[PDB]
Amino acid sequence: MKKIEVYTQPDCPPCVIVKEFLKHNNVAYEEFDVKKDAAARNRLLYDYDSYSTPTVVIDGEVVAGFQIEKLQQLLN
């Protein structure tokens, strides 16, 4: 796992919101598009046990869905 992973897909405004929040905060993330990257899709569903995007993984912690304040907490 990378230290900060962000799972997204197209036509997903909540994903854009999370990403842009992360960017505004100058967070060093890596992003994965689960429609275009099958491995990333498999990690989301079968490693992280998350059914939707956005999902962010922060040093192993899975934050599934739209949870801004939990992200702020976890990031520093």
Residue numbers in the entry: 1 to 76
Give verbatim excerpts from the published study on this entry:
The crystal structure of oxidized BC3987 was solved and we have related the results from the phylogenetic analysis to structural features, enabling us to map parts of the protein involved in hydrogen bonds near the active site. In the wild type structure residues 1–76 and 3–75 are observed in chain A and B, respectively. Due to the insert of one Leu amino acid at position 44 in the BC3987 protein, the α2 helix is positioned slightly closer to the β-sheet layer compared to E. coli NrdH. Contrary to what is seen in the NrdH-redoxins from E. coli and C. ammoniagenes crystal structures the Thr8 residue in BC3987 has a rotamer where the hydroxyl group is pointing away from the buried Cys15 Sγ-atom. This orientation of Thr8 is stabilized by a hydrogen bond to a water molecule (HOH34). Both proline residues in the BC3987 active site have the trans-conformation with ω-angles of 177° and 176° for the Pro13 and Pro14, respectively.
The thioredoxin BC3987 found in B. cereus ATCC 14579 is conserved among all the members of the B. cereus group, including B. anthracis, B. mycoides, B. pseudomycoides, B. thuringiensis and B. weihenstephanensis. Like E. coli and C. ammoniagenes NrdH the BC3987 have a α/β/α Trx fold typical for all members of the Thioredoxin superfamily. The BC3987 protein has a C-P-P-C active site motif that differs from what is typically observed for Trxs and Grxs.
